[PDB]
Curated annotation (Swiss-Prot):
Reaction(s) catalysed by this chain's protein: Preferential cleavage: Arg-|-Xaa, Lys-|-Xaa
GO molecular function: endopeptidase activity; metal ion binding; serine-type endopeptidase activity; serpin family protein binding
CDD domains registered for this protein in UniProt: Tryp_SPc
Tissue expression remark: Synthesized in the acinar cells of the pancreas.
Gene name linked to the record: PRSS1
PANTHER family listed in its UniProt record: RIKEN CDNA 2210010C04 GENE, TRYPSIN-RELATED
Protein name: Serine protease 1
EC top class, as a word: hydrolase
UniProt xrefs under Gene3D superfamilies: Trypsin-like serine proteases
Obligatory cofactor(s): Ca(2+)
EC number from the UniProt entry: 3.4.21.4
Length: 223
């Protein structure tokens, strides 16, 4: 997260860290045994870390649970990142409490102008690299598709939405991938891609979760 602020320990209870010997992507807990992340974060040997704040220090509220199954969206395209979404089932159910909780799925799609919360342990610099050990937060609005296209020259699909600031300075970044974009207390997006980080006229692009609710529910029900 570039240009954000320190969230505060466990204030984003649904945030998860995907670990394969080190943190490599974020994710969101949607129920006691399932996590949603980005398809481009797919990898074998994933351990899900819940209740985290400082990812390099055991602070007392963590829950480390190995993944038993990963399901990448059937239509994921790694070239365009269309359908950049993946489901991860935990080997055992997490113990839900005030520091470890699930985030609800949306019943409707959020409109442009809506303010959302983006969080992650990703790079905090637009130029160079600096990775924080504690969770960072960013308040960002959903941009209209028309304004995003005209300013960035990105090619986005109906399964994506831009969020952030065209003026640059604030944005998600490397390492925040797979993380949550929460608006009105519901999971509306997943950190997917962007050109660099916090660059002018190059906002972040997010997976539009509201288009996948049916797939998510059906998959969880039979797996
Ligand atoms: C990969 O390194 C980076 O610093 C960022 C990461 C990132 C990830 C998710 C969201 C954001 C964001 N801005 N909100 C940033 N992405 C890039 O800089 C990628 N742009 S790119 O034009 O460098 C590019 C595009 C395609 C390939 C195969 C490789 C590189
Ligand atoms: Ca920790």
């Amino acid at each position: 997260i570039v240009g954000g602020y320190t969230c505060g320990a466990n204030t984003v209870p649904y945030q998860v860290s995907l670990n394969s010997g080190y943190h490599f992507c974020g994710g969101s807990l949607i129920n006691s045994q399932w996590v949603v992340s980005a398809a481009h974060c797919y990898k074998s040997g994933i351990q899900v870390r819940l209740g985290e704040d400082n990812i390099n220090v055991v602070e007392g509220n963590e829950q480390f649970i190995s993944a038993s199954k990963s399901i990448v969206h059937p239509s994921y395209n790694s070239n365009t990142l269309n359908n950049d979404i993946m489901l991860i089932k935990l080997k055992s159910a997490a113990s839900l409490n005030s520091r470890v909780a699930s985030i609800s799925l949306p019943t409707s799609c959020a409109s442009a102008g809506t303010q959302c919360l983006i969080s992650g342990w990703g790079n905090t610099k637009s130029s160079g690299t600096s990775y924080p050990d504690v969770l960072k937060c960013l308040k960002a609005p959903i941009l209209s598709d028309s304004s995003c296209k005209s300013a960035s020259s990105y090619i986005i699909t109906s399964n994506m939405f831009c969020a952030g600031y065209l003026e640059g300075g604030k944005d998600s970044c490397q390492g925040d991938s797979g993380g949550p974009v929460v608006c009105s207390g519901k999971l509306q997006g997943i950190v997917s891609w962007g050109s660099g980080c916090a660059q002018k006229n190059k906002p972040g692009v997010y997976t539009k979760v509201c288009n996948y609710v049916s797939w998510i529910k059906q998959t969880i029900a039979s797996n």
